[PDB]
Design a binder for this molecule. Structure first.
Ligand code: HEM
Length: 82
């Protein structure tokens, strides 16, 4: 199955409430992880509500972070959208 979520929402979910990002067209909520993340919130929150796919890869994130990303999957970025 899929859950889907629209760019409308994904942009919106970006401000200390929910923080959503697109990593390979799947949609990833963190919000709590913002606390943990070595990269910090700000930078991530600013990539949030958009495609952070390239950026995520660019940083060369580890398997554990990748794994984490799987469990963070809430959603997908809608088809009408893309
Ligand atoms: C799915 C959400 C993500 C998770 C689970 C995650 C996890 C992590 C973890 C655990 C580290 C340490 C290095 C590693 O384990 O690879 C890290 C570092 C970092 N991340 Fe992320 N990250 C995520 C998304 C992002 C995104 C989209 C950005 C873009 C803002 C980003 C920017 C950074 C930066 C700047 C560092 C610092 C590199 C260092 O440790 O020196 N991360 N991340």
């Amino acid at each position: 199955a899929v859950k889907y979520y629209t760019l409308e929402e994904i942009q919106k979910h970006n401000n200390s409430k929910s923080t959503w990002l697109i990593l390979h067209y799947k949609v990833y909520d963190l919000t709590k992880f913002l606390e943990e993340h070595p990269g910090g919130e700000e930078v991530l929150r600013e990539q949030a509500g958009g495609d952070a796919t390239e950026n995520f890869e660019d940083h060369g994130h580890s398997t554990d972070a990748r794994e984490l990303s799987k469990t963070f999957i809430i959603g997908e970025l809608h088809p009408d959208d893309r």
